[PDB]
Structure 1
């Protein structure tokens, strides 16, 4: 359900199942931010700005949370 934007290709991208679960668990727990890793890369998702920050370079990639329709369609 979480996505990050890639400015090189101009497209939204999905996280791995593990990183998506780490982000979503912190989101549901009321945390304002969450740290996660992808190989040698280290990131912080800042929920107050909806931005992923690369801890090493400071590169910012916007993030989004997909929303399910309420009510659900038949």
Structure 2
């Protein structure tokens, strides 16, 4: 239903991997405040109240955004 993206240091947007985007979307759809995500051996908090990804070790916050997926399932 959705493709979530995160913003890099050059200001460019990157799609989350497919399963991570599913995890984020499912939490967003039910109104969660936040969901934890692990990728690349890192742990991120996805904070829906601020629409940011937060690295739980470094404190870096990055913007996230949601695009609709047109593709019919």
Structure 2, unaligned stretches of length 5 or more?
none
Q: Deviating runs (4+, > 3 A) in structure 1?
A: none
Match of 2:64 in 1: 63
Aligned to 1:14: 15
Unmatched segments (≥5 aa) in structure 1: 69-74
User: Which of the pair has the greater relative contact order for Cα pairs under 8 Å at 6+ separation?
Assistant: 2
Deviation at 1:67, TM superposition (A): 4.5
The structure having more radius of gyration, on CA atoms, is: 1
Q: Number of paired residues?
A: 68
